[PDB]
Design a protein around this ligand. Structure first.
Ligand code: HEM
Ligand code: NCT
Length: 464
């Protein structure tokens, strides 16, 4: 008969007086200390059930998986996507788009050799580019995102972008500004009060324009692809989707139409660019702050692999310390703190509470990555979190940065391959120094909201 407890809201504003839009994660955690790991919060007029720590999140998303498999709102992205595409759909749409995308991703070689060689080759152009700097002092931002983007772009668009291409650069700028915006106070305030704020001047309009620009681009590529489409041989993800469109025109409740094509392709391009990009970014800063951890990775690379051969994905099994470090980077980086919002499909019973149909659910993925029962020093950067006393790699059940449950990151295979081979080919060739001193490096997040954004920095790439 009852909603979980939480602080008393006010009309329209909800729990505004208890939330700090600069630090929403620290706000919900603070309310947690008082109310328990399972509480109700009103983000303006939206009613939201928050789940903190491993047990509550798992119990929701794994044990009652089917009830918690809907999608709640992320307002900024909703403005553009409007319930279309894979990421921000629900019900029958998501289930259909999700299964298409997974099967197609498998068909383009994901988690197999075709994509390994494409990443290996693409990692080559990155080294080359990084040498083309001659150890000068640079922003690594768009060096990483150009290399990262090209992997998913081979798959969605059919071929890589050229690095000098001015439109490519413009797209990666759109992506980074959009994403960043969601991590700002204004972006979080935008989560409570969007119905008024969408009609107002400020940083949000900029975000809309970048998203529109990204939509403008995919929508053009598609018109192109439609006219040289060869139905028995797809060049790309766009082709595959267009073929499925034909096969299904005689079904009027099909999910396969133009609008879901544009939006899903956008999902992949955006998610397959900015996540790995940002994680590599954060990860570089972390290693520079911790140069002792940097040397053991080097040591372990020089012995399983060498100077000679390109690193390959299966090289990880014999490289326990490097895998611990990659996990610890993802663990500390905390890409999305509050996950993507969930919602219950139906009236649901959960631990003595009742959630009416339609209730938004925040599973706080950041609080699982920081759960004290699973990690000895949660707020520190410490590879030993993923190693035994033997130095073998150890799994954690709270390593959930890709989430869990019905709506899990189906990009996981790809990201993990990319994360591994990109971290490893770069450090094979380079060691990192910064203009700044290891004890003076700020590894605290620049922005925390929907995403976790590392501070702006510069570094140099010096050969080995
Ligand atoms: C640093 C790497 C990445 C992280 C930390 C990450 C994390 C996540 C998270 C937390 C979700 C939400 C899951 C949920 O709602 O419970 C998600 C979903 C999703 N991700 Fe990733 N991801 C990463 C890489 C990628 C890549 C490379 C792709 C490209 C194919 C991708 C595509 C997607 C899509 C389409 C969804 C929506 C799935 C759905 O709604 O059912 N992600 N990811
Ligand atoms: C970054 N992402 C991982 C989960 C959703 C996905 C995303 C976010 C915004 C726009 N498109 C895709």
């Amino acid at each position: 008969g009852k909603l979980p407890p939480g602080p008393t809201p006010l009309p329209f504003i909800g729990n505004y007086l208890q939330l700090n839009t600069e630090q929403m994660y620290n706000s919900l955690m603070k309310i947690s200390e008082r109310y328990g790991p399972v509480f109700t919060i009103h983000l303006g007029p939206r009613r939201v059930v928050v789940l903190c720590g491993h047990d509550a999140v798992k119990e929701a998303l794994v044990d009652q998986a089917e009830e918690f498999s809907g999608r709640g709102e992320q307002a900024t992205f909703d403005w553009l996507f409007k319930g279309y595409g894979v990421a921000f759909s629900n019900g029958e749409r998501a289930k259909q788009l999700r299964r298409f995308s997974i099967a197609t991703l498998r068909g383009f070689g994901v988690g197999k050799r075709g994509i390994e060689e494409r990443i290996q080759e693409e990692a080559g152009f990155l080294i080359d580019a990084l040498r083309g700097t001659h150890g000068a002092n640079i922003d690594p931002t768009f060096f990483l995102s150009r290399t990262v983007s090209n992997v998913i772009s081979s798959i969605v668009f059919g071929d890589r972008f050229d690095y000098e291409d001015k439109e490519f650069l413009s797209l990666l700028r759109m992506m980074l500004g959009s994403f960043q915006f969601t991590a700002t106070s204004t972006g979080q305030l935008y989560e409570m009060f969007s119905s008024v704020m969408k009609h107002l001047p400020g940083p949000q309009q900029q975000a809309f324009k970048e998203l529109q620009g990204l939509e403008d681009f995919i929508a053009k590529k598609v018109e192109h692809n439609q006219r040289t489409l060869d139905p028995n041989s797809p060049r790309d993800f766009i082709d595959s989707f267009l073929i499925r469109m034909q096969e299904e025109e005689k079904n009027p409740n099909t999910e396969f139409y133009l609008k879901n094509l544009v939006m899903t392709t956008l999902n992949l391009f955006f998610a397959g660019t900015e996540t790995v990009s940002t994680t590599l970014r954060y990860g570089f800063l972390l290693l520079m702050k911790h140069p002792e951890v940097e040397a053991k990775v080097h040591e372990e690379i020089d012995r399983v692999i060498g100077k000679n051969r390109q690193p390959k994905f299966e090289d990880r099994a014999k490289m326990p310390y490097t895998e611990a470090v990659i996990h610890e980077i993802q663990r500390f980086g905390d890409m999305l703190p509050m996950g993507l919002a969930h919602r219950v499909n139906k009236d649901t019973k959960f631990r003595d509470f009742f959630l009416p149909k339609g209730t938004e659910v925040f599973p706080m993925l950041g609080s699982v990555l920081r759960d004290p029962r699973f990690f000895s020093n949660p707020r520190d950067f410490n590879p030993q979190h993923f190693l035994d006393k033997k130095g073998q790699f150890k799994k954690s059940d709270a390593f959930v940065p890709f989430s869990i449950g019905k709506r899990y990151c189906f990009g996981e295979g790809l990201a993990r391959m990319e994360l591994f081979l990109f971290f490893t080919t770069i450090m094979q060739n380079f060691r990192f120094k910064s203009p700044q001193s290891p004890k003076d490096i700020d590894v605290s997040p620049k922005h925390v909201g929907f995403a976790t954004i590392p501070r702006n920095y510069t570094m140099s790439f010096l050969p080995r």
